[PDB]
mmCIF file of all heavy atoms in Angstrom:
data_model
loop_
_atom_site.group_PDB
_atom_site.id
_atom_site.type_symbol
_atom_site.label_atom_id
_atom_site.label_comp_id
_atom_site.label_asym_id
_atom_site.label_seq_id
_atom_site.Cartn_x
_atom_site.Cartn_y
_atom_site.Cartn_z
ATOM 1 N N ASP A 213 105.226 87.657 81.297
ATOM 2 C CA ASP A 213 104.133 88.719 81.174
ATOM 3 C C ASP A 213 103.130 88.307 80.256
ATOM 4 O O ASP A 213 101.879 88.636 80.501
ATOM 5 C CB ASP A 213 104.689 90.063 80.785
ATOM 6 C CG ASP A 213 105.663 90.086 79.680
ATOM 7 O OD1 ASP A 213 106.195 88.983 79.398
ATOM 8 O OD2 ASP A 213 105.893 91.148 79.081
ATOM 9 N N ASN A 214 103.454 87.629 79.198
ATOM 10 C CA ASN A 214 102.424 87.039 78.272
ATOM 11 C C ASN A 214 101.578 86.102 79.052
ATOM 12 O O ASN A 214 100.407 86.196 79.127
ATOM 13 C CB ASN A 214 103.023 86.236 77.267
ATOM 14 C CG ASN A 214 102.979 86.985 75.926
ATOM 15 O OD1 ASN A 214 101.848 87.226 75.378
ATOM 16 N ND2 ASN A 214 104.086 87.440 75.403
ATOM 17 N N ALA A 215 102.252 85.171 79.751
ATOM 18 C CA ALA A 215 101.616 84.110 80.610
ATOM 19 C C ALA A 215 100.486 84.789 81.331
ATOM 20 O O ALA A 215 99.388 84.282 81.296
ATOM 21 C CB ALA A 215 102.616 83.595 81.590
ATOM 22 N N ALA A 216 100.768 85.955 82.045
ATOM 23 C CA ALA A 216 99.791 86.627 82.823
ATOM 24 C C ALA A 216 98.549 87.107 82.047
ATOM 25 O O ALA A 216 97.508 87.053 82.593
ATOM 26 C CB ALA A 216 100.471 87.810 83.615
ATOM 27 N N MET A 217 98.797 87.517 80.804
ATOM 28 C CA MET A 217 97.656 87.853 79.860
ATOM 29 C C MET A 217 96.843 86.648 79.463
ATOM 30 O O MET A 217 95.625 86.738 79.467
ATOM 31 C CB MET A 217 98.117 88.560 78.621
ATOM 32 C CG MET A 217 98.996 89.724 78.881
ATOM 33 S SD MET A 217 99.035 90.801 77.580
ATOM 34 C CE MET A 217 99.168 89.698 76.133
ATOM 35 N N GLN A 218 97.541 85.586 79.130
ATOM 36 C CA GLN A 218 96.885 84.339 78.721
ATOM 37 C C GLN A 218 96.191 83.549 79.832
ATOM 38 O O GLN A 218 95.209 82.835 79.539
ATOM 39 C CB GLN A 218 97.911 83.476 78.031
ATOM 40 C CG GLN A 218 98.528 84.196 76.804
ATOM 41 C CD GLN A 218 97.603 84.384 75.746
ATOM 42 O OE1 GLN A 218 97.513 85.431 75.087
ATOM 43 N NE2 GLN A 218 96.725 83.376 75.537
ATOM 44 N N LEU A 219 96.525 83.774 81.087
ATOM 45 C CA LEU A 219 95.886 83.056 82.148
ATOM 46 C C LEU A 219 94.440 83.556 82.388
ATOM 47 O O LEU A 219 93.615 82.815 82.815
ATOM 48 C CB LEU A 219 96.654 83.185 83.509
ATOM 49 C CG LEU A 219 97.815 82.289 83.755
ATOM 50 C CD1 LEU A 219 98.574 82.808 84.957
ATOM 51 C CD2 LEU A 219 97.319 80.824 83.973
ATOM 52 N N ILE A 220 94.170 84.798 82.015
ATOM 53 C CA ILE A 220 92.875 85.319 81.985
ATOM 54 C C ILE A 220 92.161 85.396 80.773
ATOM 55 O O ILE A 220 90.974 85.234 80.557
ATOM 56 C CB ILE A 220 92.757 86.798 82.663
ATOM 57 C CG1 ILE A 220 93.576 87.770 81.867
ATOM 58 C CG2 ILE A 220 93.234 86.764 84.081
ATOM 59 C CD1 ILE A 220 94.280 88.760 82.783
ATOM 60 N N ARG A 221 92.948 85.530 79.622
ATOM 61 C CA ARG A 221 92.367 85.483 78.364
ATOM 62 C C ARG A 221 91.906 84.098 77.853
ATOM 63 O O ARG A 221 90.873 83.951 77.265
ATOM 64 C CB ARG A 221 93.333 86.113 77.297
ATOM 65 C CG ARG A 221 92.965 85.896 75.831
ATOM 66 C CD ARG A 221 94.014 86.606 74.983
ATOM 67 N NE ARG A 221 93.697 88.056 75.030
ATOM 68 C CZ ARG A 221 94.255 88.886 74.072
ATOM 69 N NH1 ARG A 221 94.922 88.477 73.077
ATOM 70 N NH2 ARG A 221 93.899 90.124 74.257
ATOM 71 N N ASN A 222 92.754 83.124 78.138
ATOM 72 C CA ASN A 222 92.600 81.773 77.552
ATOM 73 C C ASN A 222 93.300 80.639 78.352
ATOM 74 O O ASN A 222 94.194 80.041 77.831
ATOM 75 C CB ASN A 222 93.093 81.772 76.134
ATOM 76 C CG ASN A 222 92.672 80.559 75.347
ATOM 77 O OD1 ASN A 222 91.821 79.814 75.785
ATOM 78 N ND2 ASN A 222 93.296 80.444 74.158
ATOM 79 N N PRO A 223 92.836 80.523 79.591
ATOM 80 C CA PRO A 223 93.455 79.420 80.431
ATOM 81 C C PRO A 223 93.274 77.993 79.835
ATOM 82 O O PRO A 223 94.007 77.092 80.213
ATOM 83 C CB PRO A 223 92.780 79.607 81.706
ATOM 84 C CG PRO A 223 91.722 80.542 81.623
ATOM 85 C CD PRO A 223 91.918 81.292 80.397
ATOM 86 N N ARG A 224 92.302 77.753 78.873
ATOM 87 C CA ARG A 224 92.115 76.418 78.281
ATOM 88 C C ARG A 224 93.411 75.986 77.405
ATOM 89 O O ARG A 224 93.463 74.787 77.170
ATOM 90 C CB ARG A 224 90.815 76.366 77.488
ATOM 91 C CG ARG A 224 89.669 75.725 78.313
ATOM 92 C CD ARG A 224 88.423 75.634 77.514
ATOM 93 N NE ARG A 224 88.135 76.776 76.690
ATOM 94 C CZ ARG A 224 87.328 77.798 77.079
ATOM 95 N NH1 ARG A 224 86.630 77.743 78.108
ATOM 96 N NH2 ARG A 224 87.124 78.861 76.261
ATOM 97 N N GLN A 225 94.238 76.859 77.019
ATOM 98 C CA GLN A 225 95.396 76.480 76.272
ATOM 99 C C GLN A 225 96.430 75.694 77.063
ATOM 100 O O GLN A 225 97.299 75.095 76.527
ATOM 101 C CB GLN A 225 96.051 77.712 75.705
ATOM 102 C CG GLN A 225 96.899 78.447 76.646
ATOM 103 C CD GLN A 225 97.278 79.688 76.123
ATOM 104 O OE1 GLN A 225 96.632 80.723 76.518
ATOM 105 N NE2 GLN A 225 98.301 79.719 75.283
ATOM 106 N N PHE A 226 96.311 75.774 78.384
ATOM 107 C CA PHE A 226 97.338 75.213 79.332
ATOM 108 C C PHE A 226 97.114 73.866 79.939
ATOM 109 O O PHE A 226 95.903 73.541 80.375
ATOM 110 C CB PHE A 226 97.493 76.222 80.510
ATOM 111 C CG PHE A 226 98.010 77.540 80.065
ATOM 112 C CD1 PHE A 226 97.351 78.716 80.443
ATOM 113 C CD2 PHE A 226 99.274 77.564 79.423
ATOM 114 C CE1 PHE A 226 97.950 79.911 80.128
ATOM 115 C CE2 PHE A 226 99.833 78.795 79.173
ATOM 116 C CZ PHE A 226 99.224 79.980 79.459
ATOM 117 N N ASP A 227 98.117 73.149 80.082
ATOM 118 C CA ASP A 227 98.054 71.806 80.772
ATOM 119 C C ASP A 227 99.054 71.976 81.971
ATOM 120 O O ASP A 227 98.603 72.107 83.158
ATOM 121 C CB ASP A 227 98.558 70.720 79.888
ATOM 122 C CG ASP A 227 98.538 69.379 80.433
ATOM 123 O OD1 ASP A 227 97.824 69.132 81.494
ATOM 124 O OD2 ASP A 227 99.353 68.491 79.916
ATOM 125 N N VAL A 228 100.325 72.105 81.636
ATOM 126 C CA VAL A 228 101.314 72.191 82.681
ATOM 127 C C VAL A 228 102.117 73.410 82.379
ATOM 128 O O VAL A 228 102.506 73.648 81.306
ATOM 129 C CB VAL A 228 102.209 70.982 82.718
ATOM 130 C CG1 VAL A 228 102.779 70.722 84.127
ATOM 131 C CG2 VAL A 228 101.355 69.783 82.349
ATOM 132 N N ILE A 229 102.369 74.276 83.444
ATOM 133 C CA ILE A 229 103.240 75.395 83.323
ATOM 134 C C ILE A 229 104.314 75.249 84.364
ATOM 135 O O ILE A 229 103.990 74.990 85.496
ATOM 136 C CB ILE A 229 102.568 76.677 83.551
ATOM 137 C CG1 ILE A 229 101.319 76.757 82.667
ATOM 138 C CG2 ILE A 229 103.565 77.803 83.270
ATOM 139 C CD1 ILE A 229 100.312 77.854 83.022
ATOM 140 N N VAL A 230 105.541 75.423 83.969
ATOM 141 C CA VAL A 230 106.687 75.251 84.861
ATOM 142 C C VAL A 230 107.300 76.647 84.813
ATOM 143 O O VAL A 230 107.480 77.222 83.788
ATOM 144 C CB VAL A 230 107.588 74.137 84.399
ATOM 145 C CG1 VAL A 230 108.031 74.276 82.918
ATOM 146 C CG2 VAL A 230 108.890 74.026 85.286
ATOM 147 N N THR A 231 107.687 77.143 85.973
ATOM 148 C CA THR A 231 108.318 78.471 86.010
ATOM 149 C C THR A 231 109.199 78.753 87.268
ATOM 150 O O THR A 231 109.178 77.894 88.238
ATOM 151 C CB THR A 231 107.208 79.572 85.972
ATOM 152 O OG1 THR A 231 107.864 80.864 85.675
ATOM 153 C CG2 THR A 231 106.481 79.737 87.318
ATOM 154 N N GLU A 232 110.081 79.740 87.158
ATOM 155 C CA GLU A 232 110.975 80.096 88.289
ATOM 156 C C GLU A 232 110.322 80.655 89.635
ATOM 157 O O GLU A 232 109.121 81.059 89.676
ATOM 158 C CB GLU A 232 112.075 81.009 87.848
ATOM 159 C CG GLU A 232 111.675 82.394 87.450
ATOM 160 C CD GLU A 232 111.817 83.311 88.615
ATOM 161 O OE1 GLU A 232 112.933 83.283 89.179
ATOM 162 O OE2 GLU A 232 110.854 84.000 88.869
ATOM 163 N N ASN A 233 111.080 80.718 90.687
ATOM 164 C CA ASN A 233 110.500 80.870 92.022
ATOM 165 C C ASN A 233 109.587 82.081 92.204
ATOM 166 O O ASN A 233 108.503 81.881 92.854
ATOM 167 C CB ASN A 233 111.642 80.904 93.100
ATOM 168 C CG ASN A 233 111.011 81.119 94.472
ATOM 169 O OD1 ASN A 233 110.925 80.197 95.292
ATOM 170 N ND2 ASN A 233 110.600 82.388 94.774
ATOM 171 N N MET A 234 109.989 83.181 91.649
ATOM 172 C CA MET A 234 109.287 84.415 91.842
ATOM 173 C C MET A 234 108.029 84.314 91.039
ATOM 174 O O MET A 234 106.890 84.421 91.470
ATOM 175 C CB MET A 234 110.077 85.606 91.527
ATOM 176 C CG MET A 234 109.420 86.972 91.673
ATOM 177 S SD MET A 234 109.227 87.631 93.377
ATOM 178 C CE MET A 234 107.815 86.735 93.909
ATOM 179 N N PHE A 235 108.182 84.169 89.652
ATOM 180 C CA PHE A 235 107.195 84.163 88.751
ATOM 181 C C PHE A 235 106.063 83.223 89.264
ATOM 182 O O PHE A 235 104.956 83.639 89.326
ATOM 183 C CB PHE A 235 107.674 83.728 87.319
ATOM 184 C CG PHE A 235 108.584 84.749 86.812
ATOM 185 C CD1 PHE A 235 109.490 84.340 85.684
ATOM 186 C CD2 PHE A 235 108.764 86.029 87.270
ATOM 187 C CE1 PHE A 235 110.441 85.266 85.136
ATOM 188 C CE2 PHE A 235 109.695 86.951 86.773
ATOM 189 C CZ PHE A 235 110.522 86.509 85.704
ATOM 190 N N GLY A 236 106.430 82.024 89.601
ATOM 191 C CA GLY A 236 105.433 81.132 90.063
ATOM 192 C C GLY A 236 104.616 81.641 91.222
ATOM 193 O O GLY A 236 103.431 81.428 91.265
ATOM 194 N N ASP A 237 105.260 82.340 92.167
ATOM 195 C CA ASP A 237 104.427 82.997 93.129
ATOM 196 C C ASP A 237 103.288 83.917 92.527
ATOM 197 O O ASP A 237 102.195 83.777 92.903
ATOM 198 C CB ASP A 237 105.379 83.802 93.974
ATOM 199 C CG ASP A 237 104.688 84.332 95.162
ATOM 200 O OD1 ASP A 237 103.563 83.892 95.453
ATOM 201 O OD2 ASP A 237 105.349 85.169 95.848
ATOM 202 N N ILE A 238 103.747 84.716 91.554
ATOM 203 C CA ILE A 238 102.859 85.636 90.996
ATOM 204 C C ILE A 238 101.752 84.960 90.085
ATOM 205 O O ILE A 238 100.523 85.217 90.215
ATOM 206 C CB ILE A 238 103.601 86.681 90.115
ATOM 207 C CG1 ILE A 238 104.528 87.468 91.079
ATOM 208 C CG2 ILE A 238 102.681 87.609 89.355
ATOM 209 C CD1 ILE A 238 105.169 88.626 90.494
ATOM 210 N N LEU A 239 102.136 83.894 89.365
ATOM 211 C CA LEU A 239 101.200 83.262 88.455
ATOM 212 C C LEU A 239 100.269 82.306 89.192
ATOM 213 O O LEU A 239 99.033 82.377 88.823
ATOM 214 C CB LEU A 239 101.954 82.562 87.262
ATOM 215 C CG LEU A 239 102.623 83.649 86.342
ATOM 216 C CD1 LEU A 239 103.139 83.034 85.028
ATOM 217 C CD2 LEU A 239 101.689 84.815 86.043
ATOM 218 N N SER A 240 100.719 81.535 90.068
ATOM 219 C CA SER A 240 99.779 80.849 90.983
ATOM 220 C C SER A 240 98.667 81.799 91.596
ATOM 221 O O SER A 240 97.560 81.629 91.176
ATOM 222 C CB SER A 240 100.612 80.264 92.185
ATOM 223 O OG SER A 240 100.671 78.843 92.080
ATOM 224 N N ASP A 241 99.144 82.848 92.310
ATOM 225 C CA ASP A 241 98.149 83.677 92.831
ATOM 226 C C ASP A 241 97.149 84.229 91.747
ATOM 227 O O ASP A 241 95.947 84.360 92.044
ATOM 228 C CB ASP A 241 98.730 84.732 93.728
ATOM 229 C CG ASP A 241 99.207 84.110 95.087
ATOM 230 O OD1 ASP A 241 98.842 82.984 95.398
ATOM 231 O OD2 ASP A 241 100.071 84.731 95.773
ATOM 232 N N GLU A 242 97.598 84.497 90.507
ATOM 233 C CA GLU A 242 96.761 84.945 89.519
ATOM 234 C C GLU A 242 95.853 83.831 89.050
ATOM 235 O O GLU A 242 94.651 83.988 89.022
ATOM 236 C CB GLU A 242 97.497 85.624 88.334
ATOM 237 C CG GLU A 242 96.702 85.757 87.051
ATOM 238 C CD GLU A 242 97.485 86.270 85.827
ATOM 239 O OE1 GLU A 242 98.767 86.131 85.855
ATOM 240 O OE2 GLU A 242 96.941 86.921 85.001
ATOM 241 N N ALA A 243 96.393 82.725 88.646
ATOM 242 C CA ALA A 243 95.607 81.613 88.137
ATOM 243 C C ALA A 243 94.570 81.225 89.156
ATOM 244 O O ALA A 243 93.497 80.875 88.844
ATOM 245 C CB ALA A 243 96.501 80.443 87.822
ATOM 246 N N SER A 244 94.904 81.452 90.441
ATOM 247 C CA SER A 244 93.912 81.094 91.490
ATOM 248 C C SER A 244 92.595 81.807 91.376
ATOM 249 O O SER A 244 91.557 81.339 91.888
ATOM 250 C CB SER A 244 94.580 81.368 92.920
ATOM 251 O OG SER A 244 95.588 80.460 93.142
ATOM 252 N N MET A 245 92.529 82.962 90.674
ATOM 253 C CA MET A 245 91.331 83.651 90.557
ATOM 254 C C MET A 245 90.426 83.064 89.475
ATOM 255 O O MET A 245 89.204 83.234 89.551
ATOM 256 C CB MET A 245 91.629 85.122 90.134
ATOM 257 C CG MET A 245 92.363 85.856 91.219
ATOM 258 S SD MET A 245 91.591 85.607 92.772
ATOM 259 C CE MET A 245 90.699 87.100 93.080
ATOM 260 N N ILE A 246 90.988 82.278 88.607
ATOM 261 C CA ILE A 246 90.252 81.647 87.644
ATOM 262 C C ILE A 246 89.067 80.866 88.237
ATOM 263 O O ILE A 246 87.985 80.989 87.754
ATOM 264 C CB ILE A 246 91.069 80.659 86.729
ATOM 265 C CG1 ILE A 246 91.857 81.483 85.765
ATOM 266 C CG2 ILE A 246 90.188 79.647 85.988
ATOM 267 C CD1 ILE A 246 93.039 80.759 85.204
ATOM 268 N N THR A 247 89.298 80.191 89.372
ATOM 269 C CA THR A 247 88.243 79.455 89.966
ATOM 270 C C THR A 247 87.381 80.303 90.950
ATOM 271 O O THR A 247 86.189 80.012 91.150
ATOM 272 C CB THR A 247 88.647 78.100 90.521
ATOM 273 O OG1 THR A 247 88.757 78.202 92.042
ATOM 274 C CG2 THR A 247 90.012 77.707 89.892
ATOM 275 N N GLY A 248 88.041 81.233 91.657
ATOM 276 C CA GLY A 248 87.185 82.127 92.359
ATOM 277 C C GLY A 248 87.375 82.043 93.840
ATOM 278 O O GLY A 248 87.872 82.968 94.455
ATOM 279 N N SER A 249 86.969 80.955 94.439
ATOM 280 C CA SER A 249 87.208 80.849 95.875
ATOM 281 C C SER A 249 88.404 80.069 96.098
ATOM 282 O O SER A 249 88.585 78.940 95.800
ATOM 283 C CB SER A 249 86.034 80.203 96.570
ATOM 284 O OG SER A 249 86.314 80.015 98.012
ATOM 285 N N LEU A 250 89.280 80.788 96.834
ATOM 286 C CA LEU A 250 90.544 80.063 97.218
ATOM 287 C C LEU A 250 90.267 78.826 97.944
ATOM 288 O O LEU A 250 91.109 78.016 98.235
ATOM 289 C CB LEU A 250 91.448 81.071 98.025
ATOM 290 C CG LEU A 250 92.545 81.737 97.274
ATOM 291 C CD1 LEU A 250 92.037 82.503 96.047
ATOM 292 C CD2 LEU A 250 93.253 82.730 98.190
ATOM 293 N N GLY A 251 88.966 78.686 98.321
ATOM 294 C CA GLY A 251 88.503 77.646 99.185
ATOM 295 C C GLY A 251 88.413 76.300 98.439
ATOM 296 O O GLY A 251 88.243 75.215 99.097
ATOM 297 N N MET A 252 88.420 76.355 97.127
ATOM 298 C CA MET A 252 88.468 75.219 96.365
ATOM 299 C C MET A 252 89.936 74.599 96.304
ATOM 300 O O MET A 252 90.097 73.385 96.307
ATOM 301 C CB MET A 252 87.955 75.365 95.008
ATOM 302 C CG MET A 252 86.491 75.721 95.056
ATOM 303 S SD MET A 252 85.405 74.342 95.530
ATOM 304 C CE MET A 252 85.164 74.625 97.345
#
Side-chain angles (χ1 to χ4, degrees):
Chain A
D213 46 340
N214 254 293
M217 308 201 316
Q218 301 293 139
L219 280 166
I220 58 219
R221 162 177 290 196
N222 193 11
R224 266 181 317 260
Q225 79 192 98
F226 291 127
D227 178 24
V228 206
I229 311 165
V230 51
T231 196
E232 70 94 47
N233 178 103
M234 178 77 281
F235 298 161
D237 190 11
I238 300 191
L239 295 193
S240 255
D241 291 340
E242 166 186 23
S244 290
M245 297 314 257
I246 283 158
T247 106
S249 175
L250 264 51
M252 298 288 98

